[PDB]
Amino acid sequence: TGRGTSSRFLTSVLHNGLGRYVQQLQRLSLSLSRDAPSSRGAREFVEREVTDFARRNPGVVVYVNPRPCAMPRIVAEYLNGAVREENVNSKSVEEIKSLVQKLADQSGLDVIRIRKPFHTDNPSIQGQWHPFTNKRTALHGLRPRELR
Amino acid sequence: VKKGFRAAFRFQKELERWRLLRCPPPPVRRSEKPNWDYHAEVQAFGSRLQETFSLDLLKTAFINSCYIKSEEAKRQSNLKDNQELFEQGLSFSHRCLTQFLEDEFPDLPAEGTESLVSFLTGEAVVCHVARNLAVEQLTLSAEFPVPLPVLRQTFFAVIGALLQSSGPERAALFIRDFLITQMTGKELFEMWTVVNPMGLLVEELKKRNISAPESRLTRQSGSTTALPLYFVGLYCDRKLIAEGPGETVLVAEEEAARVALRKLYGFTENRRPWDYSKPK
Amino acid sequence: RTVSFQAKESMIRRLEVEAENHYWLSMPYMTAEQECGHAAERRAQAFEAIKAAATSKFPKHRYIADQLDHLNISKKWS
Amino acid sequence: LRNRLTDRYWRVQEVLKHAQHFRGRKNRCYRLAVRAVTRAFVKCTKARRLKKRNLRTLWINRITAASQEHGLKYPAFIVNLIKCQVELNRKVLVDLAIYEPKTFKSLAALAKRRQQEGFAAALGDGKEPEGIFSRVVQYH
Amino acid sequence: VHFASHQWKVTAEDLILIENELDIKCGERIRLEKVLLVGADNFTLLGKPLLRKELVRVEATVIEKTESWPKINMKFRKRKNFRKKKIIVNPQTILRINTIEIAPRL
Amino acid sequence: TYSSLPDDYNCQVDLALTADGRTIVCYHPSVDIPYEHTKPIPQPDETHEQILKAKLEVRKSKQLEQGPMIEQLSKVFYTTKHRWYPHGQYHNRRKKLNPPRDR
Amino acid sequence: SSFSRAPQQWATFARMWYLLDGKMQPPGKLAVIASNKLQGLNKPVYHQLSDCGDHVVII
Amino acid sequence: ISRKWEKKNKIVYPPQLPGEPRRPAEIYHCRRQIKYSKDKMWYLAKMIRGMSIDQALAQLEFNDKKGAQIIKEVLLEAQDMAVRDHNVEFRSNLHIAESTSGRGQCLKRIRYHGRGRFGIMEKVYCHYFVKLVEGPPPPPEVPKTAVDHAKDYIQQLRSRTIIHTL
RNA sequence: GUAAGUUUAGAUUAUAGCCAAAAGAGGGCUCUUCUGGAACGGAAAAAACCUUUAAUAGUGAAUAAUUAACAACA
Ligand SMILES: [Mg+2]
Ligand SMILES: [Mg+2]
């Protein structure tokens, strides 16, 4: 499946942790139905947990739209431009609450095979190895068997 | 003909996917699409960065002159520009960026510390930084996608609005976090273009009253083949200052000059890492 | 065949360990008679636990709450 | 024909999406593609374990090259560092040799010296002072 | 630095990926406490097997908490079939190394 | 001269133990190349392209045919001829347009 | 260190020329040294996909 | 059955602005049911690829195959409509961008054998497609020079990285 | 030292094995009797010999089995 799929290297959006950490999630949309058994669990989430989540995360704008609906759905958008969409059909409050927290922590970068765990832009402090390191020089720079 | 409508419904969705790939839709600004409230979006912008802004000032920054022209033309069939804030914001950034660089690299020449500031205030860096902070989404203009000169202007206007509200010390942290970070992993001459590096080196050595260097061939391999390696070292007063690798003697010798210059100005690869630790 | 050097050594090392096993098994702390009855109480208690679990099977309680909670499937915002 | 399966289109696409990068009729014929995909998945699972073993061989190969530049064989270098209470693993040692040549040379001398101390202790017999680098710190 | 069950060669501004949940909020600073070696251009210090707390201090930050991409596990069995298959996804976290400091207490 | 490795090529190794005996200190300054061990640059007679053109001299038949041209190329770069032949359209269309870059 | 990107890469992967003298030596022992350098197993940057061999000259 | 090649002639672009290169004209033409094998027609359609209208018509006039005459007549009609309906100025200023053959609807019959046996016979048909683009034929292919080959080889060597390490 | 065993009620499938190692009996087969086995590692490929308590992610670590062995006098 690796040869059947794309891959990338480990990175961060804008050097997130160097100076100050910025939260990538910026918008949430949740759609509901007033009276539909499928969306009962989402309704309870609005009743109890929606306001508390908004306060703990003040950089995210949350939209709640009751309307005639068949499947409740959540849309998450990020600063780098990614968009993610999830169905919430007939799920419990606990399931939805835990799902939302995962979205907050994520950065919009694609979830695919990552080639290496570690990324460094300054791998060497003493100088990268080349063949001439560890080779002694010679007087007058005479290559082997040169008479001079 | 099978009974049921659910399979027909599913297939309509796939036909939608196929059509999009073949005929990608033209870009649209997020304001047009649903789930948009301008007032709420602006407030989250400030809180996202852990900085406090005055709402009246911040909104003015996003407005652009071209936007006013479009509205009036539609109107025939008040506002207030960000021009004042743009000039103030850009001016401080140039001075603030220069102050950072000189302390870090005092020896480095004046022309150098102008190229780096020009490099870090160009469209490439500013436009790239602006988009990932949502500045493009909140901009008001007559053309979308926003042209880079327009996008760049609105970015510095925002810094100007931050300067007025919270003063110099806060803005200096803002420039460090978002603009100075962009030089991580960048070699000096990648940001500053110098032709004839040897000529510059000779003048610099004269100022400190040092003798002109003597070029010599420290190491050699495969000279007569089509893939040769050369090491050239600049010797001063029979003392080594720099050593450089290259394909040809001329290329390798030029490489030694750049190595020497970097050490003189203290912009080496193994130099002390920049400091973001200070909370003040 | 010829037995390789590795095989000969590996076998010797295992022989040496077993030799020590013989030694440490030659010095019983208690004789047979002293052992008799020294652990009777603990053993008897253990079986009592086993028997109690075996004879404890029975159906489970049924509650009105479980049956009537099914009606919440049609809860709504009025 | 009272009841007929109406979803066969999507059940077919599940297999065929994993076969688009094959060559031949294996990438478009279901009866052939299905056999090839399961063989690929079996290989994918068995190669997760084999990968870890392969990388260790690569590390040992590169370490032998780095040590021999200083005149040391691989067994001597690794063993003596352990006797000095150094617990660096093979993966990190390869990084130092490639990216920290001076630090690697320092470790090369340390391992060589500890080897020499062991040789002296072996030849000399009786009670003699132990080597400076042959002293073991204790924990409790 | 020895962290989790792995050893990492580290420097300031580096990114590290840990393949399990950590219980730390995003944006939080941490101190790595098992350090085996610290080095500079001209000198290096080696612990036996660990350096003392006074000498070296390493700090890191939690940047992202995520999950891995789906991994396919399909045991080898007669009558393998294409649906006798499992998908494994593990939680992950990313740390950015911030600073390394030393003090003159040798 | 306590170091057991010669100090003349890469660096000078000085190894010491702290008083408590819990840390090992390493001092490794670099060694610079002596002036007496260098050669003068041959200023009297250079871009790598010029070297290639002299190597890949077109002398007979103007532009040579595939086969003879490939034999010339293999000698210059010390390869076999098989390296230089093209491939079909199946392999050329599989190639990635934008492979990832690390740093 | 402090080289430009391209010269740094060129230096690391360059190919070296070596000399061996075979007078009175056994051919088998000579082969071991030559095979080591031909494959590139003398370099800490060795990989089977990197083509890191060197030239060997025997007289 | 699909007939899309015909409708391609009815696309209308918006007027070009003054500061823009002049867009060349395009013509699509085909003949649908032909009593000829598509495999045989392929060799004829392949030959005239990339050539100008006059060179194509010259080579067709001296070919002995039955397909050559049919292709020539289709080419002549395409030239006539190009000037008459698609605002082409000069007849000679045209070249063949696309030319290919396609399968048609066929018929099944019986073929007799010698012991009361039989076989299934197909009476085969094919289509022919062309696209004419105004302008001189684009320049031909030039094989890579020895210097060009080498420059690629150095590029390959420069791309190498240290694999599976920090 | 250790956790199974009997009674009651219900229910099929199966009723030809294979190789290694012991002891016999009719004289290489053929029967009878006790023990063991069914690698993804090893013995060159390797159902049956040897190492091996289940199955998961990791660019960690310590080990097991492991086809080779070193022509006269005295
Ligand atoms: Mg292993
Ligand atoms: Mg037929």
Side-chain angles (χ1 to χ4, degrees):
Chain A
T1 300
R3 290 192 74 138
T5 303
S6 52
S7 70
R8 72 178 170 85
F9 285 113
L10 196 57
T11 47
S12 52
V13 176
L14 263 177
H15 304 108
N16 200 7
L18 274 188
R20 73 181 65 189
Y21 161 78
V22 165
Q23 190 183 23
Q24 301 301 326
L25 174 64
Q26 68 160 355
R27 195 182 300 91
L28 277 182
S29 308
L30 171 57
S31 50
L32 299 171
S33 166
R34 175 205 300 171
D35 45 359
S38 68
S39 69
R40 181 185 50 143
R43 278 192 296 264
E44 308 321 318
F45 171 84
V46 160
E47 291 171 58
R48 290 161 29 167
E49 305 298 335
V50 65
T51 47
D52 302 333
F53 172 87
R55 278 167 189 146
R56 288 184 315 267
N57 296 313
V60 178
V61 185
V62 184
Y63 300 89
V64 162
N65 303 320
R67 53 150 160 273
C69 192
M71 289 208 200
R73 202 175 293 92
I74 285 170
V75 185
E77 307 183 58
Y78 295 75
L79 292 167
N80 75 357
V83 182
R84 186 160 152 189
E85 196 157 355
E86 296 288 325
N87 281 283
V88 182
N89 181 62
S90 81
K91 288 184 179 179
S92 80
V93 194
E94 300 189 15
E95 289 174 346
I96 303 171
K97 190 184 180 173
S98 61
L99 160 60
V100 171
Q101 188 52 225
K102 293 177 181 178
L103 296 170
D105 297 357
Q106 290 171 357
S107 168
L109 294 179
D110 300 346
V111 183
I112 57 182
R113 189 181 64 97
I114 288 162
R115 288 203 188 196
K116 283 182 281 193
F118 39 76
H119 164 237
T120 47
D121 274 5
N122 284 279
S124 179
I125 297 89
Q126 310 173 357
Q128 192 175 124
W129 176 98
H130 58 64
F132 282 126
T133 63
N134 296 325
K135 274 188 206 295
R136 69 189 57 261
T137 53
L139 188 54
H140 309 302
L142 281 178
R143 89 182 46 97
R145 297 179 74 88
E146 187 184 11
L147 285 165
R148 198 206 186 202
Chain B
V1 68
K2 319 197 178 207
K3 62 192 82 163
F5 66 90
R6 292 185 65 242
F9 178 81
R10 282 185 81 172
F11 203 66
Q12 288 287 350
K13 293 185 146 179
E14 292 203 1
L15 290 175
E16 182 55 18
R17 284 203 305 98
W18 297 345
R19 184 177 315 114
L20 290 197
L21 286 180
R22 305 187 293 86
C23 305
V28 165
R29 67 187 80 178
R30 178 73 177 70
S31 299
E32 311 303 352
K33 298 199 276 274
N35 285 345
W36 193 248
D37 178 11
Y38 199 74
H39 194 216
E41 296 283 350
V42 182
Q43 310 182 40
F45 174 96
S47 61
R48 204 171 292 124
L49 298 152
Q50 272 168 341
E51 278 186 338
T52 67
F53 291 66
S54 54
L55 270 291
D56 50 352
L57 277 294
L58 192 51
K59 293 186 177 181
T60 52
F62 296 126
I63 306 185
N64 272 123
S65 68
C66 52
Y67 176 89
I68 294 172
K69 325 289 202 55
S70 65
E71 305 321 325
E72 299 298 327
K74 297 185 177 183
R75 201 155 300 160
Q76 286 163 354
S77 72
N78 292 338
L79 283 53
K80 167 179 170 189
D81 287 312
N82 55 339
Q83 187 65 39
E84 179 183 2
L85 291 162
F86 168 49
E87 293 178 353
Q88 187 174 4
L90 195 149
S91 310
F92 170 86
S93 46
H94 183 278
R95 306 173 167 183
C96 189
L97 286 165
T98 302
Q99 188 57 256
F100 277 126
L101 280 167
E102 292 196 346
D103 316 325
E104 185 76 26
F105 304 116
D107 305 334
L108 195 148
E111 291 75 6
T113 68
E114 182 171 352
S115 81
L116 296 177
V117 176
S118 77
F119 168 74
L120 294 172
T121 49
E123 294 184 6
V125 174
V126 161
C127 73
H128 166 78
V129 166
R131 286 200 173 93
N132 293 44
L133 292 180
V135 176
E136 187 164 18
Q137 306 188 9
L138 282 158
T139 310
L140 303 187
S141 80
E143 292 179 350
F144 185 78
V146 180
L148 269 62
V150 167
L151 189 73
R152 189 209 186 206
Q153 179 174 357
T154 58
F155 176 82
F156 285 115
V158 160
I159 289 170
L162 166 60
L163 198 149
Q164 295 205 357
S165 307
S166 74
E169 288 70 1
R170 302 297 307 281
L173 288 173
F174 187 92
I175 290 183
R176 191 193 66 188
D177 300 358
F178 299 94
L179 292 184
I180 296 292
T181 42
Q182 295 296 339
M183 77 192 286
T184 47
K186 307 268 298 178
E187 191 263 329
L188 172 61
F189 296 109
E190 297 178 9
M191 299 166 290
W192 181 26
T193 49
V194 176
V195 193
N196 177 226
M198 192 66 76
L200 188 150
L201 173 55
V202 159
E203 295 178 352
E204 298 293 326
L205 280 174
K206 182 170 70 172
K207 295 176 181 178
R208 273 87 60 191
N209 179 22
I210 312 300
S211 180
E214 182 204 351
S215 173
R216 299 188 66 76
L217 200 72
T218 54
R219 298 183 178 281
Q220 197 187 15
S221 184
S223 47
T224 61
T225 59
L227 298 167
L229 173 70
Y230 288 106
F231 264 102
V232 170
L234 302 181
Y235 274 77
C236 191
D237 287 341
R238 271 193 162 64
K239 171 197 69 75
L240 187 48
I241 63 172
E243 188 168 3
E247 297 86 5
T248 75
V249 162
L250 275 181
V251 169
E253 157 180 327
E254 180 175 358
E255 186 57 22
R258 291 183 192 290
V259 174
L261 287 173
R262 288 181 197 118
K263 287 174 172 175
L264 267 174
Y265 301 153
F267 198 93
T268 50
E269 165 162 358
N270 50 359
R271 79 179 178 282
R272 180 75 66 102
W274 193 274
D275 181 308
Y276 311 82
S277 172
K278 302 153 186 165
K280 60 181 179 180
Chain C
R1 293 191 61 169
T2 65
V3 184
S4 59
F5 188 62
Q6 293 173 349
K8 303 160 71 52
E9 282 184 355
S10 67
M11 179 166 291
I12 290 159
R13 293 175 184 169
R14 283 182 190 261
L15 273 163
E16 289 166 345
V17 171
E18 182 155 351
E20 181 153 336
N21 278 359
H22 288 160
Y23 166 71
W24 289 123
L25 269 158
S26 58
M27 313 185 313
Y29 185 71
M30 297 176 45
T31 73
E33 294 73 10
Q34 303 177 57
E35 186 187 2
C36 204
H38 81 265
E41 290 178 303
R42 168 177 58 85
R43 301 174 93 269
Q45 304 147 14
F47 188 53
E48 296 309 321
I50 288 171
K51 275 195 307 198
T55 73
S56 58
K57 289 190 282 178
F58 212 61
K60 284 192 138 191
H61 307 281
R62 287 177 169 233
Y63 301 80
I64 286 188
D66 309 341
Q67 169 172 129
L68 291 192
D69 183 44
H70 187 83
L71 288 175
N72 280 321
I73 297 169
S74 60
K75 192 157 44 202
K76 333 171 196 297
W77 286 339
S78 53
Chain D
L1 293 192
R2 182 166 189 297
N3 268 345
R4 303 171 74 185
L5 185 65
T6 57
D7 269 6
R8 212 176 277 105
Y9 173 80
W10 289 269
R11 312 187 174 198
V12 165
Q13 297 303 319
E14 289 168 4
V15 168
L16 286 181
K17 72 184 291 302
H18 297 299
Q20 283 184 29
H21 67 287
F22 299 168
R23 93 199 282 158
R25 284 187 293 169
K26 292 197 297 287
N27 59 55
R28 45 192 193 269
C29 296
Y30 177 93
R31 158 187 312 253
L32 308 171
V34 76
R35 294 165 190 171
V37 170
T38 74
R39 280 190 70 83
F41 287 175
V42 173
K43 287 179 200 283
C44 185
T45 307
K46 292 174 182 175
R48 214 169 278 121
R49 292 311 293 164
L50 182 63
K51 158 188 194 176
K52 296 152 170 72
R53 288 187 260 153
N54 279 338
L55 274 168
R56 175 141 152 156
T57 291
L58 179 66
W59 297 331
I60 291 177
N61 276 336
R62 294 170 153 177
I63 288 165
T64 305
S67 88
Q68 278 286 6
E69 278 205 287
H70 303 301
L72 284 171
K73 303 184 185 180
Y74 169 88
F77 179 71
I78 291 283
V79 168
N80 297 129
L81 278 174
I82 279 165
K83 290 172 194 265
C84 290
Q85 277 183 325
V86 187
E87 295 298 354
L88 298 159
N89 67 10
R90 295 166 182 67
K91 172 195 147 205
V92 162
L93 280 184
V94 163
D95 287 7
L96 302 176
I98 293 164
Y99 284 114
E100 309 295 330
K102 277 146 74 186
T103 303
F104 192 87
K105 188 165 156 47
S106 308
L107 274 166
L110 185 67
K112 196 161 188 161
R113 185 177 173 87
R114 177 69 186 72
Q115 197 193 14
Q116 281 165 350
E117 291 184 12
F119 290 148
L123 303 168
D125 267 317
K127 294 179 179 179
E128 287 89 47
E130 65 179 341
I132 288 178
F133 292 90
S134 169
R135 303 200 271 255
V136 63
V137 166
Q138 304 259 331
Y139 286 84
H140 78 297
Chain E
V1 169
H2 178 286
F3 194 45
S5 193
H6 307 295
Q7 302 182 13
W8 318 73
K9 176 178 174 183
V10 159
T11 199
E13 314 161 329
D14 174 8
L15 285 172
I16 295 310
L17 183 80
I18 308 295
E19 305 192 351
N20 68 65
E21 170 153 349
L22 268 192
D23 209 319
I24 312 164
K25 288 179 182 178
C26 274
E28 208 157 295
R29 212 172 185 99
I30 306 292
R31 186 192 177 179
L32 315 189
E33 301 196 335
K34 301 177 163 164
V35 58
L36 285 77
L37 184 153
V38 60
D41 186 356
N42 281 292
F43 63 89
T44 48
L45 317 168
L46 304 174
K48 293 160 50 83
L50 291 157
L51 292 171
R52 297 187 287 139
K53 273 293 205 55
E54 300 90 359
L55 293 165
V56 192
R57 185 195 197 68
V58 179
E59 284 180 359
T61 302
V62 167
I63 304 312
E64 208 190 9
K65 311 172 76 170
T66 48
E67 59 202 12
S68 81
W69 75 304
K71 297 176 192 167
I72 291 189
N73 188 350
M74 178 150 161
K75 313 185 188 177
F76 73 99
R77 291 172 189 265
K78 62 176 289 299
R79 192 180 73 184
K80 298 173 188 63
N81 310 131
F82 168 83
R83 328 177 180 200
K84 274 175 65 180
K85 171 173 46 63
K86 325 175 166 185
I87 300 297
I88 296 151
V89 300
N90 302 112
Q92 289 170 336
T93 55
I94 312 179
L95 296 159
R96 183 185 290 286
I97 311 295
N98 282 119
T99 68
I100 308 181
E101 312 165 314
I102 45 173
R105 293 191 205 187
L106 294 171
Chain F
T1 307
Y2 305 89
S3 73
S4 63
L5 293 201
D7 273 7
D8 47 11
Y9 51 91
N10 184 10
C11 54
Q12 292 182 337
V13 168
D14 285 345
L15 288 176
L17 264 167
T18 54
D20 61 359
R22 294 166 201 182
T23 299
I24 299 173
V25 178
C26 295
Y27 188 54
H28 46 69
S30 293
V31 301
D32 287 4
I33 304 176
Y35 185 103
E36 292 293 326
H37 288 232
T38 68
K39 271 175 154 40
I41 53 166
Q43 293 183 154
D45 293 334
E46 192 76 14
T47 76
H48 194 236
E49 314 205 315
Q50 298 168 354
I51 301 168
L52 275 190
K53 285 199 177 179
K55 297 275 181 184
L56 299 184
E57 181 60 25
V58 57
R59 305 181 80 272
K60 197 179 178 171
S61 176
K62 281 210 155 199
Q63 200 169 347
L64 290 79
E65 297 182 356
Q66 278 201 355
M69 179 174 51
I70 285 174
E71 295 302 324
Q72 173 79 269
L73 278 159
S74 78
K75 283 176 58 175
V76 168
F77 294 111
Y78 295 90
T79 73
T80 68
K81 69 178 184 287
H82 310 79
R83 189 270 172 199
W84 304 91
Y85 285 99
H87 273 87
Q89 261 169 350
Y90 173 69
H91 283 292
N92 285 330
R93 289 173 144 94
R94 278 152 56 86
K95 189 169 179 193
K96 292 170 189 172
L97 306 173
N98 295 298
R101 290 187 184 176
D102 191 16
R103 51 187 182 273
Chain G
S1 197
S2 304
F3 304 151
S4 303
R5 276 86 165 94
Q8 174 69 78
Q9 195 270 344
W10 190 264
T12 293
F13 281 107
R15 48 174 61 157
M16 310 301 289
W17 291 73
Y18 294 104
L19 175 60
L20 263 176
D21 190 5
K23 186 187 285 288
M24 284 280 177
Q25 299 307 290
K29 292 191 154 79
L30 285 163
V32 184
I33 303 162
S35 52
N36 196 252
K37 311 279 173 171
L38 289 174
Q39 312 194 39
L41 279 171
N42 51 334
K43 305 190 186 168
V45 296
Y46 160 92
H47 203 295
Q48 294 171 327
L49 311 165
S50 286
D51 198 25
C52 48
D54 297 302
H55 297 260
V56 170
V57 176
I58 309 180
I59 58 164
Chain H
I1 71 167
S2 297
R3 304 289 187 256
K4 302 170 168 181
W5 206 251
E6 281 74 335
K7 293 180 177 183
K8 285 193 171 314
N9 275 343
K10 313 185 175 201
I11 301 158
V12 183
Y13 303 76
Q16 261 184 325
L17 312 183
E20 192 174 351
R22 186 187 181 83
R23 172 171 313 128
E26 288 168 321
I27 303 91
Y28 295 81
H29 199 236
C30 55
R31 185 178 290 177
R32 282 297 187 176
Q33 286 279 119
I34 302 162
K35 189 75 191 69
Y36 209 58
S37 173
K38 77 170 159 51
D39 281 339
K40 290 165 178 162
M41 187 74 73
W42 189 84
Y43 286 102
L44 281 150
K46 164 71 176 185
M47 170 195 63
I48 61 166
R49 268 180 197 160
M51 290 155 73
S52 66
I53 192 69
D54 296 298
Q55 193 184 345
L57 286 167
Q59 301 284 321
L60 288 175
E61 179 185 344
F62 296 96
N63 208 341
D64 279 341
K65 290 175 187 293
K66 183 222 276 202
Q69 178 70 20
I70 301 157
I71 295 181
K72 178 148 56 68
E73 303 171 11
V74 169
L75 283 180
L76 286 169
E77 306 174 26
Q79 187 174 30
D80 194 1
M81 55 186 48
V83 172
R84 199 203 45 246
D85 289 329
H86 304 285
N87 195 42
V88 168
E89 188 154 40
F90 306 104
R91 305 192 319 203
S92 81
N93 206 26
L94 286 160
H95 67 275
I96 295 90
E98 309 193 358
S99 83
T100 191
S101 72
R103 196 183 183 263
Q105 292 183 103
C106 299
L107 295 165
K108 288 203 194 71
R109 301 285 189 266
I110 311 298
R111 186 161 264 264
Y112 293 79
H113 284 232
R115 285 179 185 259
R117 307 304 186 96
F118 59 103
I120 296 294
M121 173 196 288
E122 189 189 8
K123 319 287 299 202
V124 57
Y125 290 77
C126 74
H127 309 300
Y128 182 65
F129 312 86
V130 293
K131 168 164 107 145
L132 289 199
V133 166
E134 189 179 22
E141 303 301 317
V142 185
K144 296 173 70 176
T145 62
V147 174
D148 295 332
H149 275 282
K151 287 178 182 294
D152 297 358
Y153 184 75
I154 296 89
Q155 262 196 36
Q156 182 201 13
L157 295 171
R158 285 203 191 272
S159 280
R160 284 178 293 180
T161 69
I162 318 171
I163 302 174
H164 283 161
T165 192
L166 190 148

